[PDB]
Every structure is written in structure tokens, then in C-alpha cells.
């Protein structure tokens, strides 16, 4: 009974901190073992492999791996998690002398250090002359998190964090609308639990 | 090798055989076709290493394969269902597990052609307050209406694609969730500085690249038939 076993399909690293991504196979004599990436929109990249030559493998990029045969463990490492770190990771191993067999992928978040956070919520509008309109709450820290809409004719989106090159800035967004007359985005993220201090424009 | 995969998206309505190609140039014996679905990893279809020697992998189901040659490995749908909706990888590997990966192929397919539908793409502007109180300039881009989820957006500022600045969200939301055929909905934010947000002769374009039917498909409805194409929405900066 070969198999693969990856931990968590989501996982989050605070910007900075230790990256650490886990994986262990079942396999009774030691495999060969593989660490993929996927980075958004494309193809699978290796990163490291183990092939019973080094247990500590060092990979592209600050990443390594230890080959543990004591505790059936492959752990992919890198020292500091970086905006750019964000993309999906396959542990995958050797099975029956003729494949590679995957897991199941953890998908890595990069939580931005976000030292002065200005928790706000936004209205904008349409560029042509309909009187349509979407809100949009950013610029929160770490520690808050966006719901799902209890509202069918409302809609809301998970947070998404952008990285702004030109100041060498990080922000988190989440964007609501609705087709209703009722709707006004004061209104809009109701149902999350925000920080105390949002700013409301008029 | 250079691997190879054809083609690289395609849609489809259920019931009809499909064909997929890995082609090679380096010649190894041992090529592989699989799929990628969110949660899954990469499951093993088939497998082969030379000429007529084929091998089940663990979802082999409603799928068939041929190894009509050293240099190609031919994956088909037999009958298409909604559930075979993947990204599908072929691979190759030499003898010490050296592996190459194609670039994948998007394939959909749905039940109903008379379903399929572009999107339609708005840009929301810059709030003045957000302006002001941070002297950036946030746009937002809403595709909305379309059907099936098989998109890509982009944001093109004076006329150069930008990734800088840029979230998209990563899966688009269903607009009706109680229906199995519900259009979908996608919003992108695309952030600037409040001074190039401020300057008229900046140019600030969502793109939505929409995969849906062939020239070659039949289109029985009055409404536009819902080709493969691009839909965008634009907006120029404003000082007021």
C-alpha cells in the first residue's frame, strides 16, 4: 500500500516567517520522492527531488527538504515566505518501479505584514453613465476575514491580496454588489466581522 | 522532450468522443496521461512504454489511449460527461524517473451548447474618498454572465499587459448557486498611485478572454452566437 499524504489543502505563512510544507508516503522500502509547484495559471515545475543519493536536498530558490525514513517524512522548507511564494504544492513519490503518483496539493497564502492598516469601505462606480456601482473593503490586516454573503442578491467575494511594485506595497480587498435597490454598502459586509476602526465615507 | 499537447483548450457537449495528442521528441519509452481537478493532485489515467503496451491508472474509467507511435500518446474521451471537466497533463519520463510535464489542456464540457454565453465586463472607478484618505486609486473589473467557467482576465494600462498591483479573484462565483448550469461572476481590483490614477492621458483596460463555441458549431438562437473572443472594458484617468 503506496500512497502519498499531504496535509492541509490550504495552508497559511505570515509574510517573513518559516515556510514549512508537509508530506509523508507509506511506502515500506524508501522512494524516490518530489516536491512540484504550480504557480497561478501554469504548469508544474520541480522543485527538488529526493533520489537516495543526499537525505538533505537543496532545491531552487532557498528550498530544501530532509529525507527522514524514521517518521516516513519528506518536509519541504524554505527560510522566509515571500509574496511570491504563493502557488500550490505537490509532494509526490515513486510506485511500483514504473510512475510518479501525487498528493493532493496544499495551496500556500502569504498573510502580508501589514504594519498600519487603514480598514476602509469603498464605493465606486460604473465608468459609463449607468448608475451601477460595486463596494469594495480593503486595506485590512491579518486578523480579519470576509464572509460569505447571507443574501442571494448579494454578492461577495473571498479576500484577495494585491502587491503594488511601484511603493512596495501590500493590501487585502474584497469586492460586494448587488442588482438592488436596497443595497448600499454600508450595508455590504454585514455579515463579516470587520475591524472597529472601518472607515465609512459619507 | 520538447512534450507537446493538442490542443490546448477546448469545449465540448456531453455524449460526443474527444481526442487529445502528446507528442515527444526525445523518444522515451514511457509516456503518461493525466488529470488535475481542485483537491485531487494529478491522477494517473493511462500509461504506456512502447508501442501497443498500455496500462490502467487509477481513472481509467470512460477514457481509452493509443500509442500509435514512439513519439505520441493519444488520450480520447470516449463519450464525454460533465465529470471529465479537467486540466489534463501528459507526461514522459526517462528510466531514472526524470519526468516532463506538457503545458496542459483546459477541456470543458457541458451539457448544453444553449447554455454557453461571453461575458459582460464593466470598469468601476476610483473612489474619491479612497483618494483621499490614501492617496491610491483603486479600479475594479466585474465580468458577470458567463457560461462556462473557462475565462482569463487581464488589465492592459497604455496599452501593456500589467501584473503589478493586480488580485483576481481565483474562481468565479456562481450567480444562481441552486442551478447546475448557473453563469458565473469574476472581479479583479487593479491598484495605482492617486497621482497616475489622476493623469487623463493614462489608459486603464480589463481584458476577459472567453472559450466558447467554434465557428464550426450550430447556433439555433437570435442572440449573438457565443464564439471564442474577447470582451473588455476601459476607463481613461480623471484629475476632477
Known amino acids: 500500500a503506496q500512497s502519498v499524504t499531504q496535509l492541509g489543502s490550504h495552508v497559511s505563512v505570515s509574510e517573513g516567517a518559516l515556510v514549512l510544507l508537509r508530506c509523508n508516503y507509506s511506502?515500506?522500502?524508501?522512494?524516490?520522492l518530489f516536491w512540484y509547484v504550480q504557480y497561478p495559471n501554469q504548469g508544474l515545475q520541480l522543485l527538488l527531488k529526493?533520489?537516495?543519493?543526499?537525505?538533505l536536498v537543496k532545491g531552487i530558490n532557498g528550498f530544501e527538504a530532509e529525507f527522514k525514513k524514521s517518521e516516513t517524512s519528506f518536509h519541504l522548507t524554505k527560510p522566509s515566505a515571500h509574496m511570491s511564494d504563493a502557488a500550490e504544492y505537490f509532494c509526490?513519490?515513486?510506485?511500483?518501479?514504473?510512475?510518479?503518483?501525487f498528493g493532493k496539493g496544499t495551496r500556500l497564502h502569504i498573510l502580508p505584514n501589514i504594519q498600519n492598516p487603514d480598514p476602509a469601505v469603498y464605493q465606486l462606480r460604473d465608468s459609463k453613465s449607468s448608475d451601477k456601482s460595486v463596494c469594495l473593503f480593503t486595506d485590512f490586516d491579518s486578523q480579519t476575514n470576509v464572509s460569505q454573503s447571507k443574501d442571494s442578491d448579494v454578492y461577495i467575494t473571498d479576500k484577495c491580496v494585491l502587491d503594488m511594485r511601484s511603493m512596495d506595497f501590500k493590501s487585502n480587498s474584497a469586492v460586494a454588489w448587488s442588482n438592488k435597490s436596497d443595497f448600499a454598502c454600508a450595508n455590504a459586509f454585514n455579515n463579516s466581522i470587520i475591524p472597529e476602526d472601518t472607515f465609512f465615507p459619507s | 522532450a520538447d512534450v507537446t499537447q493538442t490542443p490546448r483548450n477546448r469545449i465540448t457537449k456531453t455524449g460526443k468522443r474527444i481526442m487529445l495528442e502528446c507528442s515527444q521528441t526525445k523518444g522515451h519509452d514511457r509516456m503518461y496521461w493525466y488529470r488535475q481537478d481542485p483537491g485531487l493532485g494529478l491522477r494517473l489515467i493511462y500509461y504506456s512504454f512502447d508501442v501497443k503496451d498500455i496500462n490502467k491508472g487509477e481513472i481509467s474509467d470512460g477514457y481509452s489511449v493509443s500509442r500509435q507511435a514512439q513519439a505520441k500518446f493519444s488520450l480520447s474521451l470516449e463519450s464525454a460527461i460533465p465529470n471529465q471537466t479537467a486540466l489534463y497533463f501528459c507526461?514522459?519520463?526517462?528510466?531514472?524517473?526524470?519526468?516532463?510535464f506538457g503545458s496542459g489542456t483546459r477541456l470543458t464540457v457541458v451539457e448544453d451548447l444553449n447554455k454557453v454565453s461571453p461575458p459582460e465586463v464593466a470598469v468601476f472607478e476610483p473612489s474619491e474618498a479612497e483618494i483621499s484618505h490614501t492617496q491610491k486609486a483603486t479600479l475594479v473589473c466585474l465580468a458577470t454572465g458567463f457560461y462556462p467557467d473557462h475565462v482569463e482576465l487581464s488589465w492592459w494600462v497604455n496599452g501593456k499587459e500589467v501584473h503589478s498591483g493586480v488580485c483576481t479573484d481565483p474562481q468565479p462565483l456562481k450567480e444562481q448557486p441552486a442551478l447546475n448550469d448557473s453563469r458565473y461572476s469574476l472581479s479583479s481590483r487593479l491598484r495605482v498611485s492617486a497621482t497616475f490614477w489622476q493623469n487623463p492621458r493614462n489608459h486603464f483596460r480589463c481584458q476577459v478572454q472567453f472559450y466558447g463555441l467554434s465557428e464550426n458549431d450550430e447556433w439555433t438562437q437570435d442572440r449573438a452566437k457565443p464564439v471564442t473572443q474577447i470582451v473588455s472594458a476601459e476607463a481613461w484617468g480623471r484629475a476632477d
Open positions: 529526493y533520489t537516495s543519493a543526499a537525505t
Open positions: 509526490a513519490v515513486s510506485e511500483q518501479d514504473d510512475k510518479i503518483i
Open positions: 507526461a514522459t519520463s526517462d528510466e531514472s524517473y526524470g519526468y516532463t
Open positions: 511506502s515500506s522500502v524508501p522512494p524516490y
